[PDB]
Structure 1
């Protein structure tokens, strides 16, 4: 099939007449299990019958579950027949280091470009020039933490002399939560794409379970810093509502305005194709 159903509201999913019933307050929608490639449950509120699960495996659909933090936790695994997304895990292991190095260089280049461009939009001309000077020519597989210096410059221009994790103000009371609010998107997309977040490109650190999720969210990070910077002086309890504009607001991708959910889905798919050495252009997110 083609449709990937994302159940993110209090619902009741059941099965009658080869049709996924997705009942809620708004619309007791009708969806055909023939079309459903991947059912993705995005909340803990949803109620699903065992009969539906029986006929979600019969049609070979990936039933992914999510916990309270909207993060992937378990995918329903069939004994007999398996989805078409169960072969990427066996090729993700055999991913060559060269494609990982190139795609990481591109992702980090996009991160520095986004931070420098937003600094240009943050009324810091010399700081924007310095941020681009950190990556005037993107250091090909930089061994040292030059990205550390670039982040230092960007966060110094953004949030003041220090924007590290130590300070307890909305500098981290918002950036921490937002940076976990988008980690859920990339983790969920990576597991949807049939990939394993646990092992990712340039993820030499084994301390992070969400390796590929963070590594591919690196380009999409500056949205959170932008929304925080605009509403920085406000309290954190206000930022809990301010940061939610990500889903409502549409950003430019592929030349057109799209919701960030569609953008992260497309970006994750294109990066996954790139690491498969399909030859596709590593996707770009910049404004």
Structure 2
């Protein structure tokens, strides 16, 4: 439970002191308390930081993202140990039945197609939308660049939450790490993809840099979930922790996200 998404763009040095992140540039200096921080995004290559700070950023389970020189995200910090004792959930994950993984993965993919449909309906394609519901009972441009940026953001969120629960992200429910080190996050974030799709659609006319900014909306906006308006990361935490429960067979019924 922190709330700030701290984005860094300026030639600077990040430090740690008394539970604060310490930011130093010309002549801007700034202290921010770690408990307030949800995400730290390192947008540029001109930034310098300390292993002390990174240890503490991992302690407080802060999402840390790194970027390339075109300011696209290329990776994140992946903690090894995401709770006490995470070992308990590990032995359970290895026990996940093939049949159950199926029920859950399919239930989730279904929520996605539903949300794609709702999105289409919302754009007055009543027809094409209804066609996707039918399916459910059964290149290289600015638009994709933004879609992908957005999906990477969603990915890093669920990756985080999964690790915290004591799971490994490498093991997808259908594909179990064959392609990716993060398939399981990729699987859990499926129903949330349309959240990006909406934002990008709305700004489909704009240049890439404007889509990138409008996408930070995900971290500020609030979305209907379990009858309450909640922030995206809080949803992700509940959704993830609850999905993990039904895969362990401590409950029945996958949680639902609708747009």
| Residue of 169, 177, 184 corresponding to 1:197 | 169
Deviation at 1:275, TM superposition (A): 0.6
Q: How does the TM-score come out when normalised to structure 1? A: 0.70
| Residue of 186, 204, 208 corresponding to 1:232 | 204
Deviation at 1:49, TM superposition (A): 4.5
Unaligned runs of 5+ residues in structure 1 are 16-20, 32-38, 140-166
Q: 1:121 to 1:6 in 2, by over 3 A?
A: closer
Q: Equivalent residue for 1:100?
A: 101
Deviation at 1:71, TM superposition (A): 2.4
Aligned-CA RMSD value: 3.2
Q: How does the TM-score come out when normalised to structure 2? A: 0.76
Conserved 8 A contact 1:7-1:43? no
Q: 1:248 to 1:30 in 2, by over 3 A?
A: closer
Q: Equivalent residue for 1:72?
A: 77
Unaligned runs of 5+ residues in structure 2 are 9-13, 23-29, 43-47, 67-72
Q: Equivalent residue for 2:142?
A: 170
Q: Equivalent residue for 2:26?
A: none
Q: Equivalent residue for 1:261?
A: 233
Question: Which of these two proteins has the greater Rg computed from alpha carbons?
Answer: 1
Conserved 8 A contact 2:142-2:207? yes
**C-alpha distance after superposition, 1:240-262 (max 9, x if no partner):** 11111111111111111111010
The residue correspondences of 1:83-232 to structure 2 (distance < 5 A) are 83-135=84-136, 137=137, 139=138, 167-204=139-176, 206-232=178-204
Q: Take 2:220 and 2:197, find their aligned partners in 1: how far apart are those partners?
A: 17
Q: Take 1:241 and 1:89, find their aligned partners in 2: how far apart are those partners?
A: 37
Higher share of residues assigned helix: 2
Q: Take 1:96 and 1:204, find their aligned partners in 2: how far apart are those partners?
A: 13
Deviates more, 1:65-74 or 1:87-96: 65-74
Conserved 8 A contact 1:179-1:221? yes
Deviation at 1:205, TM superposition (A): 5.9
Q: Equivalent residue for 1:22?
A: 20
Deviation at 1:112, TM superposition (A): 0.8
Runs of 4 or more off by more than 4 Å in structure 1?
A: 4-15, 26-31, 39-50, 61-67
Aligned residue pairs total 232
Q: Take 1:43 and 1:258, find their aligned partners in 2: how far apart are those partners?
A: 22
